[PDB]
Amino acid sequence: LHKEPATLIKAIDGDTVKLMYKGQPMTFRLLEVDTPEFNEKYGPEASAFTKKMVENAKKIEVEFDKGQRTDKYGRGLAYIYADGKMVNEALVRQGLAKVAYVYKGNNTHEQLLRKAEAQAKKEKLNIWS
Numbered sequence: 279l280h281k282e283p284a285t286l287i288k289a290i291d292g293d294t295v296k297l298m299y300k301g302q303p304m305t306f307r308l309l310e311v312d313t314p315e316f317n318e319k320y321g322p323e324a325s326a327f328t329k330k331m332v333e334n335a336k337k338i339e340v341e342f343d344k345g346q347r348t349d350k351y352g353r354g355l356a357y358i359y360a361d362g363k364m365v366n367e368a369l370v371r372q373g374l375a376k377v378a379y380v381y382k383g384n385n386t387h388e389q390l391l392r393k394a395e396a397q398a399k400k401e402k403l404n405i406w407s
C-alpha cells in the first residue's frame with residue numbers, strides 16, 4: 279500500500295471526513311473502524327478527536343487498501359494519516375473507536391488496529407470504561 283496526498287475540506291464526525299483527493303471533494307470513511315454516532319455516548323469525543331487531528335495536520339494523506347475504494351454510498355474507503363500518524367489507529371488506541379467492518383479485500387492493517395484496541399481495553403479507555 280502507498281500514501282497519496284489530500285487536503286482537508288471539513289471534519290464531519292469520528293470516522294468520516296471531507297477531503298480533496300485528486301482535486302475532487304469526496305467524503306472518506308475510515309477503513310476497519312467504527313466510531314459512535316454523534317448522538318451516542320462518546321460520539322462528541324470521537325468527533326472532537328478526529329477533528330483536532332485533521333485540522334492540526336500539516337499533511338493529510340490517504341492510503342487505499344487492495345480492495346474496494348468506494349462504498350455503496352460513494353464514500354472513499356481509506357486509512358487517513360495526519361502528519362504520518364494514522365487517524366484510524368489513533369481512535370482505536372484511545373478507545374474512541376472499535377475495530378469493525380473488516381472485509382477480506384481491505385484488511386491490510388487489521389492486526390495493527392487490533393493491537394491498539396487490545397491496549398485501549400487494557401487501559402479501560404473511554405468506550406472500554
Ligand SMILES: Cc1cn([C@H]2C[C@H](OP(=O)(O)O)[C@@H](COP(=O)(O)O)O2)c(=O)[nH]c1=O
Binds near residue numbers: 308312384
Ligand atoms: C467501513 C465500511 C463501511 N461500509 C458500509 C457498511 C455499512 O452498511 P449500512 O449502511 O448498510 O449499515 C455502512 C457503515 O458505515 P457507518 O458506520 O458510517 O454507518 O457503510 C462498507 O461498505 N465498507 C467499509 O469498508
Ligand SMILES: [Ca+2]
Binds near residue numbers: 315
Ligand atoms: Ca459510525
